[model samples]
Target: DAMIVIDGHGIIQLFSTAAERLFGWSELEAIGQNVNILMPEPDRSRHDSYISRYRTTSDPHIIGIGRIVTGKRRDGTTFPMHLSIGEMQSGGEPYFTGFVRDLTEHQQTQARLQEL
Candidate 1:
């Protein structure tokens, strides 16, 4: 029922305490920022595309599924995190809530596997 809410244009409307603490950003600081601020590189650039694609076709790579994704912290460190997107439509522009979980321990497994 709670997480981060963003508009079609990627403006964060509501940022919950978990997100605030997760990225070391406060509501005051994050509400107006683009959702991609929490992501890194290609995802940051492609995120907006996904939103637009969903609005047009009801299909996108990052919605209605949970996956291990990369996230960028305020401290500029990047890590693997689980991201789940919820699509809620209350009319104009649709709404998106992203629930992301840190994978601190599991990331170590991937990092090691990635090396080989």
Candidate 2:
């Protein structure tokens, strides 16, 4: 499973080996970076603001419910992914965990089946 944990500030705190493979980032390089480093384009730019909006409104766009989105790799390539996010409070601080599934092959298979 591709899994990652981030602090309330959206800074990565834990990066799993699977996540390292998926995003092409070493645990050492990813741990201190923003979670948005895994996102592409507008999402990468707006993630912080989205977090702030959720924190302020207690409303969620993707928390609890999973969504299909795009992810950016270290090589600057992008792919489709399914993402599920959860939030919790530990030691008086908030943290989030994300479980990701790469969908590149699945999409390709679907396309081929459609052509068949």
Compare the candidates by TM-score and give the number of the best one: 2
Task: Assess candidate 1 and give its TM-score to the true structure.
Answer: 0.84
lDDT, candidates in the order shown: 0.83, 0.93
Candidate 1 displacement at residue 17 in angstroms: 0.9
TM-score of model 2 relative to the true fold? 0.95
lDDT of 1 by residue, 1-116 (tens): 22788987898999998887778899999998999998889889988887778778866766878988788889998888888988887775588888878886787887899998
Per-residue lDDT of candidate 2, residues 18-46 (tens digit): 99999999999999999999998799889
Deviation in Å, model 2, residue 16 alpha carbon: 0.3
Find the 10 residues in a row with the least total lDDT in model 2: 54-63
Off by over 4 Å in 1: 109-116
